[PDB]
Write a protein that binds this DNA or RNA. Structure first.
Ligand code: MG
Ligand code: MG
Ligand code: MG
Ligand code: MG
Ligand code: MG
Ligand code: MG
Ligand code: MG
Ligand code: MG
Ligand code: MG
Ligand code: MG
Ligand code: MG
Ligand code: MG
Ligand code: MG
Ligand code: MG
Ligand code: MG
Ligand code: MG
Ligand code: MG
Ligand code: MG
Ligand code: MG
Ligand code: MG
Ligand code: MG
Ligand code: MG
Ligand code: MG
Ligand code: MG
Ligand code: MG
Ligand code: MG
Ligand code: MG
Ligand code: MG
Ligand code: MG
Ligand code: MG
Ligand code: MG
Ligand code: MG
Ligand code: MG
Ligand code: MG
Ligand code: MG
Ligand code: MG
Ligand code: MG
Ligand code: MG
Ligand code: MG
Ligand code: MG
Ligand code: MG
Ligand code: MG
Ligand code: MG
Ligand code: MG
Ligand code: MG
Ligand code: MG
Ligand code: MG
Ligand code: MG
Ligand code: MG
Ligand code: MG
Ligand code: MG
Ligand code: MG
Ligand code: MG
Ligand code: MG
Ligand code: MG
Ligand code: MG
Ligand code: MG
Ligand code: MG
Ligand code: MG
Ligand code: MG
Ligand code: MG
Ligand code: MG
Ligand code: MG
Ligand code: MG
Ligand code: MG
Ligand code: MG
Ligand code: MG
Ligand code: MG
Ligand code: MG
Ligand code: MG
Ligand code: MG
Ligand code: MG
Ligand code: MG
Ligand code: MG
Ligand code: MG
Ligand code: MG
Ligand code: MG
Ligand code: MG
Lengths: 275, 100, 68, 88, 114
RNA sequence: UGGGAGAGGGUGGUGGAAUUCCCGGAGUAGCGGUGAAAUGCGCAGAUACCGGGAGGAACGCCGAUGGCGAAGGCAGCCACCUGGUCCACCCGUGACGCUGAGGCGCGAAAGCGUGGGGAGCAAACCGGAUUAGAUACCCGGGUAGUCCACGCCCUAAACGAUGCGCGCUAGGUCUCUGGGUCUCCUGGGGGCCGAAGCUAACGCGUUAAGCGCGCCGCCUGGGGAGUACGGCCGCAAGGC
């Protein structure tokens, strides 16, 4: 449930914050954090290559286990569920009976105290990871590897999930969170369940300052600029676009598809996204 | 505790070890969900009125049982998880209603 | 030619007894009216309920084409 | 549901004398038992309005009996609601 | 070329279409009120179904067709007449099964049907 | 305390028919649609036929002059949770009762907010017809919506146009569901036809609109008007 505020300042009138209800441990695991090196949107040449970044809260990176096939057959206890600033999902602390500790992204319904496992024989239950080929068609699934042993790449965002639709040869067919229909190899791991924190999308930032805390610096309209700067720049008074709406670099930005044409994975995409 | 009659239809193109095996997952679960078995009736193959899983036949089990009321639902779910189990239907057991 | 007559004592709640049950279906597969089964109200309701369960199990059809 | 067993224990626990069924006390206590279950049930099935009516009818029924028993013998009422932890 | 097959009669209030298939179900030929030469509402008549079933069966026989199974869908006027014609065609008619599709109350019909 | 029937309510699962779209196959000159047409779709291969898949929605036969609920309403099947109600036993309580201004809850559809979902249908809207004209009816399209969750709205030909409870006043017949000494009788419900009686008539008639008591709500010529103003409610629409 998202948390509202009474309108005791102009901004609190709309601000909503997450409830943090699932959260049970308020400090990360010391040996599982490392500093996040903040970039500001600058590459190694020092140049802004992604605009409007910088200035957010300091963050420690929590190391996440996006492999999991790494420790087949060894079970673990879900020790805690925690906040992670580097992602929308919460993360779950796993105590393996081995004694190793790792983090995973926390699926909807993971209970602290429960046990999870990975491998071809794992029970089809929330929290477990198996190759896709051993997961019943119809099951909703998250953190999916896109190619075997390359790490979880799909459905990691708060609330997201993928569903297994069918099988074909060495591949299963997934419905991605976008609704794309795609073949993913049978040997790729996925974890049963959807990602938690599904209310994430209902948060209302509420004020300029909150975007600022997120490291998101103000974004300025091409329309508010000059011709040296942008296709929409200039004109006396306000102006309509005056040409097909364009990015600062001139490419058209309402409809122009941009996926590379001859791309090898086209062969594995069955149906481009919906809506 | 109440009496129910678990019906089950299994994959018909199984060899007898897989079938014995499926029966094993089944009987372990009946036990695990606190079901105590009473009768049991295994009429095996039998022709279906229509294809299930695109297949004119089905392998039929059946089990009058006594189990916790709260667990019948979760059991039916666990009974379905196998790709070879094609139907489950767990019915409250009841007296015959006779005609003639 | 009422069906209830052309049978001996049978269980109306017995859904696995396809041999009895299948007689109450029209040749098109539909559950037969009271005027053809000779059932009363109370019994006919128990019939329809167990025929429906039976179709679920695979024992009875949901529909059958009409041959001439 | 309520089991005959659970009902009996309550019937027995509240009865004014061995064979007592249906006295005021037994009546109130049985209701209290059905009340507290429905109440619990509705806590989970909030959209079960149809059962909620029944709840109200029962709540109503227990009230009248309590009003009766309070008029007839204060001590017995005070004790009953105290035995069942009722007022609010 | 194949000796036995199927004949489907799609009979609706506006028309009769008849397609002749192989035993496996694939069409060998087809006809309709339209092909036999009519437009408009005349396509829906029994005489329309007749020429359609004949012309359909006739084209088939020239592919070596001899026996057919007759499948009927619809409750159109030119239904029963369509069947006459297949019998009278020079084709065997081993069976006549009506497999008109009817829902077990599914999608909401258009307004004209309520 | 024993039993009973039922689409009563909530949750979770789950089955087949059909429609639509996609994929594969096979096939070709039309299909579709009306009173008749046209728009539309179709040689860039449609319709009709076979196999595969996807998805939503509604549950054919059973089905009824049937059943359940206080009403709104409720229908594939399964389990769990849960309300009402009837019967038999005549075991317990000892008038503990009826109604009910306010209050509280529930309340078809449309509509509204946030988020899902979207096959079919379809306000608005485009187009074809019809026609003197045709902002319609009929035809081809089509977005909200119709569906789910949660929160609102609170209306109605929300009707039996018939408030609730009790007692009393012929019967005939059909029916649902109990319990009998199971021909037949006795309860509780749903219809019809009627004794007395009512009633302006039409009609009502042990399911009263008959004969009576209790309590509640409502009316007091048509229009203006369910409008204005005020107040209270509502996000708005709008409600009282
Ligand atoms: Mg707020
Ligand atoms: Mg506050
Ligand atoms: Mg608050
Ligand atoms: Mg302020
Ligand atoms: Mg403000
Ligand atoms: Mg949380
Ligand atoms: Mg939460
Ligand atoms: Mg710290
Ligand atoms: Mg260190
Ligand atoms: Mg160190
Ligand atoms: Mg780093
Ligand atoms: Mg450097
Ligand atoms: Mg440098
Ligand atoms: Mg330099
Ligand atoms: Mg940039
Ligand atoms: Mg930047
Ligand atoms: Mg987080
Ligand atoms: Mg959040
Ligand atoms: Mg927002
Ligand atoms: Mg930050
Ligand atoms: Mg932005
Ligand atoms: Mg800006
Ligand atoms: Mg500007
Ligand atoms: Mg300027
Ligand atoms: Mg410059
Ligand atoms: Mg320039
Ligand atoms: Mg420029
Ligand atoms: Mg410009
Ligand atoms: Mg300008
Ligand atoms: Mg300007
Ligand atoms: Mg100027
Ligand atoms: Mg200007
Ligand atoms: Mg300027
Ligand atoms: Mg301009
Ligand atoms: Mg412009
Ligand atoms: Mg311009
Ligand atoms: Mg790839
Ligand atoms: Mg299965
Ligand atoms: Mg009561
Ligand atoms: Mg009191
Ligand atoms: Mg026509
Ligand atoms: Mg095709
Ligand atoms: Mg060509
Ligand atoms: Mg098909
Ligand atoms: Mg007595
Ligand atoms: Mg009252
Ligand atoms: Mg009131
Ligand atoms: Mg409403
Ligand atoms: Mg509605
Ligand atoms: Mg609506
Ligand atoms: Mg809405
Ligand atoms: Mg028009
Ligand atoms: Mg015109
Ligand atoms: Mg028009
Ligand atoms: Mg239209
Ligand atoms: Mg349409
Ligand atoms: Mg559409
Ligand atoms: Mg809207
Ligand atoms: Mg609107
Ligand atoms: Mg009415
Ligand atoms: Mg009524
Ligand atoms: Mg009125
Ligand atoms: Mg009243
Ligand atoms: Mg009165
Ligand atoms: Mg009777
Ligand atoms: Mg009897
Ligand atoms: Mg009733
Ligand atoms: Mg009666
Ligand atoms: Mg009725
Ligand atoms: Mg009468
Ligand atoms: Mg008279
Ligand atoms: Mg009478
Ligand atoms: Mg009068
Ligand atoms: Mg007046
Ligand atoms: Mg008003
Ligand atoms: Mg009004
Ligand atoms: Mg006003
Ligand atoms: Mg009013």
């Amino acid at each position: 449930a998202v948390k509202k505020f009474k309108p005791y300042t102009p901004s609190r009138r709309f601000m909503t914050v997450a409830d943090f209800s699932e959260i049970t441990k308020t400090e990360p695991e010391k040996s599982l954090v490392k500093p996040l090196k903040k970039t500001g949107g600058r590459n190694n040449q020092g140049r802004i290559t992604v605009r409007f970044r910088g200035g957010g809260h300091k963050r420690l990176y929590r190391i996440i286990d996006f492999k999991r096939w790494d420790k087949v057959g060894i079970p673990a206890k879900v020790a805690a569920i925690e906040y992670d600033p580097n992602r929308s999902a919460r993360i779950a602390l796993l105590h393996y009976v081995d004694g190793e500790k790792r983090y995973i992204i926390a699926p909807d319904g993971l209970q602290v105290g429960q046990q999870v496992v990975a491998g071809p024989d794992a029970p089809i239950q929330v929290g477990n990871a198996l190759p896709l080929r051993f997961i019943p068609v119809g099951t909703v699934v998250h953190a999916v590897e896109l190619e075997p042993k390359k790490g979880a790449k799909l459905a990691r965002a708060a609330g997201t999930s993928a569903q297994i639709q069918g099988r074909e040869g060495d591949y299963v067919i997934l419905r991605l969170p976008s609704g794309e229909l795609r073949k993913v190899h049978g040997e790729c791991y996925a974890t049963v369940g959807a990602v938690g924190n599904a209310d994430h999308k209902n948060i209302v930032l509420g004020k300029a300052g909150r975007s600022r805390w997120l490291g998101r610096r103000p974004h300025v309209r091409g329309a508010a600029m000059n011709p040296v700067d942008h296709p929409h720049g200039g004109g006396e008074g306000r102006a309509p676009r005056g040409r097909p709406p364009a990015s600062p670099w001139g490419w058209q930005t309402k409809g122009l598809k941009t996926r590379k044409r001859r791309k090898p994975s086209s062969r594995f995409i069955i149906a481009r996204r919906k809506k | 505790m109440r009496r129910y009659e678990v019906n089950i239809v299994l994959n018909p193109n199984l060899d007898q070890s897989q079938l014995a095996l499926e029966k094993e997952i089944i009987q372990r679960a009946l036990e695990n969900y606190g079901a105590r078995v009473e009768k049991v009736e295994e009429l095996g193959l039998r022709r279906l009125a229509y294809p299930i899983a695109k297949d004119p036949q089905g392998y039929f089990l059946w089990y009058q049982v006594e189990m916790p009321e709260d667990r019948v639902n979760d059991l039916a779910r666990e009974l379905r998880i196998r790709d070879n189990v094609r139907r489950v239907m767990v019915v409250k057991s009841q007296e015959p209603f006779l005609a003639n | 030619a009422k069906v209830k007559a052309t049978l001996g004592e049978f269980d109306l709640r017995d859904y696995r007894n396809v041999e009895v049950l299948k007689r109450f279906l029209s040749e098109t597969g539909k559950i037969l009216p009271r005027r053809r089964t000779g059932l009363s109200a109370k019994e006919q309701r128990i019939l329809a309920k167990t025929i429906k369960r039976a179709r679920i199990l695979g024992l009875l059809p949901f529909t059958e084409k009409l041959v001439r | 549901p309520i089991t005959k067993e659970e009902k009996q224990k309550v019937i027995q626990e509240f009865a004014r004398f061995p064979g007592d069924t249906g006295s005021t006390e037994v009546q109130v206590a049985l209701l209290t038992l059905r009340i507290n279950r429905l109440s619990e049930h509705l806590k989970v099935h909030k959209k079960d309005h149809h059962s909620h009516r029944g709840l109200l009818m029962m709540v109503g029924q227990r009230r009248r009996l309590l009003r009766y028993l309070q008029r007839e013998d204060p001590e017995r009422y005070r004790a009953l609601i105290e035995k069942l932890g009722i007022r609010g | 070329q194949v000796a036995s097959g199927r004949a489907y009669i799609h009979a609706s209030y506006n028309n009769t279409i008849v397609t002749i298939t192989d035993p496996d179900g694939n069409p060998i030929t087809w006809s309709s009120g339209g092909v036999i030469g009519y437009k408009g509402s005349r396509k829906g008549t029994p005489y329309a179904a007749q020429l359609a079933a004949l012309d359909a069966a006739k084209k088939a026989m020239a592919y070596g067709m001899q026996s057919v199974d007759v499948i009927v869908r619809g409750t159109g006027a030119g239904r029963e007449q369509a069947i006459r014609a297949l019998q009278a065609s020079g084709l065997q008619v081993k069976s006549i099964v009506d497999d008109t599709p009817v829902p077990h109350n599914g999608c909401r019909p258009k307004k004209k049907f309520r």
